[PDB]
Amino acid sequence: QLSSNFGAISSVLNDILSRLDPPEAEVQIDRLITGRLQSLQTYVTQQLIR
């Protein structure tokens, strides 16, 4: 799941981080943050049930 885009321009963090100003990179970072958090929550819930 780490290679998905979730709406950003790039799925990797270092490319967007080292190519744009943080005032613009905030949105691209936020999209990845929320997507990865959702993935982790799903994994944890499944583990609890099992």
Partner 1 sequence: SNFRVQPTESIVRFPNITNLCPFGEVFNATRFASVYAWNRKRISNCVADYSVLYNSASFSTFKCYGVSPTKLNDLCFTNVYADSFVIRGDEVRQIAPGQT
- Sequence-distant (6+) residues with CB within 8 A of 26 are none
User: How many Cβ atoms from other residues are within 10 Å of residue 26's Cβ?
Assistant: 10
Q: Alpha-carbon distance 9 to 15, whole Å?
A: 10
Q: How far is the CB of 49 from partner 1 (least distance, A)?
A: 28
Of residues 15 and 42, the one with the C-beta less far from partner 1? 15
Based on the shown chain and the rule CB under 8 A, indicate whether residue 19 belongs to the binding site for partner 1.
yes
The piece of 18-26, 30-38, 39-47 that touches partner 1 (CB under 8 A) is 18-26
The piece of 19-27, 31-39, 42-50 that touches partner 1 (CB under 8 A) is 19-27
